[PDB]
Amino acid sequence: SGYTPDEKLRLQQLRELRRRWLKDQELSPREPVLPPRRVWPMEQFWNKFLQDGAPWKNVIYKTYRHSIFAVTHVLIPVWIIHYYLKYHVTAKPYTVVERKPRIFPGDTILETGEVIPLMKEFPDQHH
Amino acid sequence: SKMELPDYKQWKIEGTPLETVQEKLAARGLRDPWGRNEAWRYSGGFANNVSFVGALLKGFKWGFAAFVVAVGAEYYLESQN
Amino acid sequence: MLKIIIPTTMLLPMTWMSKHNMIWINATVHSLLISLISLSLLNQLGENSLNFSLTFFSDSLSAPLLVLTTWLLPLMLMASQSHLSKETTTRKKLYITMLILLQLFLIMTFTATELILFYILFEATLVPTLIIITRWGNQTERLNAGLYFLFYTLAGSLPLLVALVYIQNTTGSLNFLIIHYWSHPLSNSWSNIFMWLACIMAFMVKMPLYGLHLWLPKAHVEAPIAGSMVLAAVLLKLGGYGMMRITTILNPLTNYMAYPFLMLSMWGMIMTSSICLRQTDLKSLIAYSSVSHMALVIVAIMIQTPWSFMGATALMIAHGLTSSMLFCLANTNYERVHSRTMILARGLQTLLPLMATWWLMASLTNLALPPSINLIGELFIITASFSWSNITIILMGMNMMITALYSLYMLITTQRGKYTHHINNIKASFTRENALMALHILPLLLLTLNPKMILGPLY
Amino acid sequence: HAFFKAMLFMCSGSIIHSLNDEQDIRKMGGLYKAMPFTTTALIIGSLALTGMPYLTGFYSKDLIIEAVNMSYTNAWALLMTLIATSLTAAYSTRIIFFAFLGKPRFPPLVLINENNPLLINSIKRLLIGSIFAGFIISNNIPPMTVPNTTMPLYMKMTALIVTIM
Amino acid sequence: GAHLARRYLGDASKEPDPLRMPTFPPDYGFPERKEREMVATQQEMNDAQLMLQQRDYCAHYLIQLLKCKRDSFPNFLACKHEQHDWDYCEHLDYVKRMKEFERERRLLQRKKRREQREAEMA
Amino acid sequence: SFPKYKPSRLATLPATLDPAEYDISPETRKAQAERLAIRSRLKREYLLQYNDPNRLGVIEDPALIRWTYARSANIYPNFRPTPKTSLLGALFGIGPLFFWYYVFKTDRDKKEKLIQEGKLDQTFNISY
Amino acid sequence: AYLTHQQKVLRLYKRALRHLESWCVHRDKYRYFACLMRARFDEHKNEKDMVKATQLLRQAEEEFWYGQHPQPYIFPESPGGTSYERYECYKVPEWCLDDWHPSEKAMYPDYFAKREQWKRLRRESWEREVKQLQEETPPGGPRTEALPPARKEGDLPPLWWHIVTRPRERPM
Amino acid sequence: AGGGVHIEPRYRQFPQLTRSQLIQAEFFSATMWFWILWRFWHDSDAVLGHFPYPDPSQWTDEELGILPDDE
Amino acid sequence: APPLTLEAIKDRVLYVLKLYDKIDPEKLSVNSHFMKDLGLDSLDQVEIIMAMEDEFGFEIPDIDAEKLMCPQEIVDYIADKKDVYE
């Protein structure tokens, strides 16, 4: 109504306990100690190419990130799935099927060389 | 930092729309003592909010300038051709 | 088949004389090699069933189930030594012996050639399961469970025996090959109607059909985990397999008496699913879900359509795997809490992330998320039923809906919430159970990749 | 539908993020000058969603409206189209009146912030998308439906004045 | 909605019902007309596989437009004069359609005349 | 006034408009006090078990097993085949039975009298 | 405990004016109407008959419930908002940290050490606090839901550990 | 924490706004404006119709073709 | 936001209550009971408690709305509820 001293004594006793527990929740300088780990020499070279602080070196560090991205993420697919298509998938009937392109009058077909015959005059309307 | 709040004596119900709230409610026989809690909303840079047509209008001046210079350029090119 | 029978039989002396510590390791590993040997049995000729001998033969229906049992046998061994750690060595060895005898009887059942031998081993699976359910059970109505299970099975089994011996006297032989090649049309005589009922009702009791399905919510819920998974995963498939064998000499009569039971399943799969929704225990929910899936398999069987048979077989395999995994997960949670109400321990997704996953795709496969073999097996039956009768779809369409509800409901109410504060015995996930759910899950997606194997003899 | 809706969606996410995760409209206001980038993103999201001419947004809806006007349809069928465009404009201006316009209605602690490269980059990608992608696709793709030529003018412009009323 | 009002609210037979109209032969009433010519040919018609909806009397301008546009890349702003031509030719055929509509409409007025003017004999 | 929301099956009377909390009586407040007393006891010993450092496993809850046993065990022993019970059994368990059988059989025979008379589509139905 | 009339009108004022905030939306409207409703409340505090005062409360609650907002505002973290129970998926019970593997324990060493001394606090406090709640228990069954204090010095107040070691407001 | 992060809390005051983000906001608004006015001038015929609607009552009876109304 | 602190949230509450006209600048104190030290009524205490509810973002529980009176205990409940510990 009501924060009675009987209930107060509980409340700030629980306060000092809760606060000290929260100080304990705070970590320490050694926290978090991380067990020793091996580091490959290539990323040693790359972090030394990152430490110098030069603009061009940071730019080419990230473009080599992008380059390894290209080779191992967007180049090996056009490797493998093209290997799969042109020699395995396309080698079997009807696996790959393409509609005949829209061939308009006055268009030359590569194989036959004939130009599709032209059509009669347009009504020559004008607005 | 310590997060130094500004002095209270500049967050005044005066200079805010709450005046039409206060005296009107004073006419009703009461008084508004919580008004200047919101005084910062009606004061400072937050004041004089733009209208609806003004809200949609943002960037129309430079757009009109680009319009007129672009049509001048295309008038020049078609005159030359 | 003695390249699989003889090693299974000789597996008994190994456990029965192994040391106090080597029984589990030896049984697990050698059962794994047995499963590896039975993996060969997936080698199937185009249309001719592989007839190893006069008394043993296999085709594209018996072989997947046999591989399922043989691959399963290590799984009970891995799931049992948790609740079997504090036992005498002789008692543990006998538990293992019950499991091996069960697997052996299932192998002879699936590879049997004469219908009478099939009946002998099919029913003979009761005894080891009875011992497992009764002696090693932990709950109260386990003693009642054994009585209910045995009597429900036998009440159908004996009329089947009378019908089989009558067929032997009349037709000439109970051999599958003879009764199929020398099959004769069945007249619509009422004595023939009762013969069909005798030949059908035993398997439909073990199916189970709606109504006379009370032995599962009172048997699987009570059995030790190993017994529970061997029951739900394969012993339910016994009735379906037997029906697939027996409908060869049960036509064209079936259709006229297909009307009562079919819808009995079709309607029943709804109620069981609804019963799943308002459950209190995990194991009972899984049991009722098993009843509904097996009822769908019943419908597939009585349609007698090629597509229905293929979808049926796929559903049997997928349901066996999923039900075994779900029971194992329920046992893990129950043992961690020593209770089975699905409200006592909720919000354990955070505490056990790998259990959270295992439950997630266990539910997904139970919910039949495509293109899992569960979904394709269900959908083939749905298409066959729609071809047989259109309206079925809405009932079918209801089922997974309600299924989906409970298929996620327990996951919402056991891991997707807030943990209970007063409980603290939930320890770090012992990698035994996580690995066990792995050996449950990876074969499921592997068979999903190539479902032509579990597709049955109609493929 | 992807462009302007995703736009005002992550703009809404931005305003929620700035105001210590506060969502209900009655608890922010006067954020027009407080943040001009998200304000521009919001009113341009409406500027595409409501489909004023010559921007990605309209490159469907006007024709859409034309499609329902010049066709064999039902009275309610087109009535809900026009009235729903009007309703859409209603809360389109309602939300800008709440959040950025009006007087501040957010808690006293002023943490409205936009200074993040990811946020600005992500919104500006869709900004250019919602300003020219509709033009790109519309002028590019071959005509897959015979365009409706000369027709009574009263149902051509109907879509715009219902939005504005 | 004018003719719609005159048909629904007023006389249904007064306005052309959208399905059957014209209910009178084109040669009858209208001075002897001529079967609308085909600039486009069937072989060219399916050579570009135009959709059946865009397979009208007017499709010659569209096939020429696609002939230019397929040869006009990346310039998507070009071929404006030919699409304007197709728009005007669609407008011409739409004028033909409303001419059929008003032909049915006015011949329906004439039909009403023939009916009740002759019926006044009673 | 705007007439009061009559309580629904899925929404009870609002706690704001409860007459009992308004026209209170000494016995009403007494009946509301000793519930607080027993609830205080129930929170107390729960806290003692819950704050016991050596508490391991689960604090077994009698009420939970009471619910489970009531909804799992007592249902049949307490069941008496009253006329209402048998009526509900007939209406639910076996009621929709004839309904589904009738509709399915009607479709089956109606279609059957369409194949053998040739009045159905069979051109591309070689899979069933 | 029991809901006295002053409590039933304090809750009434809270609900009515928060719903009025949801209604009027704008802050100046809210201020004007809130002062007006404050007057409308305090004008007739002098209802001598408690039955008559409860009847006026009947009318007030009736009209407020008829006119309460169809979408009253609730802040997110508070019960009913968008952030309500949204952080439960992050908080983990404290006893889980007795489960961490010795590698996991040593990788956070001194926090485990201070958990060890807090655990020692819990052990040394359990018997003291149970006898403390025993000596001041309401004779023959607890009477009120209140919680007994640490009247003496150094005793951890009875039933303290879970409140003290409660998952923080923002575990993250 | 964020000790001295770029954005500074301002108790009940207008917060700081680096002129960059306002100038790009006006950049974007001016661009969408200029875009719609330029395309308005270039292609107004798209939005007001290339050809007006041919009202039918004004049509005569010759091109409309119906036989003499006094037949 | 940076970790809220006892004296910072104390500063916010003192500004918003000294801000009240009924609480003139002079009778503001760290021990300022709303009934006796400052003369406000229960209705007034609920007004100021709900103004707090609005300007802090958090929502007071009804068990605390009718009973949180002195700014010491007021800022104390704030410290406990939002884990304000420093």
Short mmCIF file of C-alpha atoms in Angstrom, two decimals, chain A residues 1-4 7-8 11 14-15 18-19 22-26, chain I residues 64 66-69 73 76-81 83-86:
data_model
loop_
_atom_site.label_atom_id
_atom_site.label_comp_id
_atom_site.label_asym_id
_atom_site.label_seq_id
_atom_site.Cartn_x
_atom_site.Cartn_y
_atom_site.Cartn_z
CA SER A 1 0.00 0.00 0.00
CA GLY A 2 3.01 -1.09 2.33
CA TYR A 3 6.73 -1.45 1.79
CA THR A 4 6.96 -2.58 5.42
CA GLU A 7 9.47 -6.82 3.95
CA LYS A 8 12.19 -4.17 3.48
CA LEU A 11 14.09 -6.60 -0.09
CA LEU A 14 17.95 -9.81 -1.64
CA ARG A 15 19.19 -6.60 -3.25
CA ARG A 18 21.34 -10.04 -6.35
CA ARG A 19 23.73 -7.18 -7.04
CA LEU A 22 25.38 -9.60 -11.01
CA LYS A 23 28.91 -8.33 -10.33
CA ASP A 24 29.83 -12.01 -10.51
CA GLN A 25 28.02 -12.24 -13.86
CA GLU A 26 30.59 -9.73 -15.09
CA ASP I 64 3.37 -2.01 -7.41
CA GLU I 66 -0.77 1.18 -5.64
CA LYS I 67 2.24 0.83 -3.33
CA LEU I 68 5.35 2.44 -4.90
CA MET I 69 5.58 5.73 -3.03
CA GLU I 73 11.92 2.49 -3.29
CA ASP I 76 14.94 0.58 -6.22
CA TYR I 77 12.20 -1.38 -7.98
CA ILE I 78 13.48 0.07 -11.26
CA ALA I 79 16.97 -1.17 -10.39
CA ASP I 80 15.69 -4.66 -9.58
CA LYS I 81 13.30 -5.05 -12.53
CA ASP I 83 18.61 -5.68 -13.76
CA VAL I 84 20.12 -2.25 -13.04
CA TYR I 85 23.18 -3.22 -11.00
CA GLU I 86 26.22 -1.39 -12.41
#
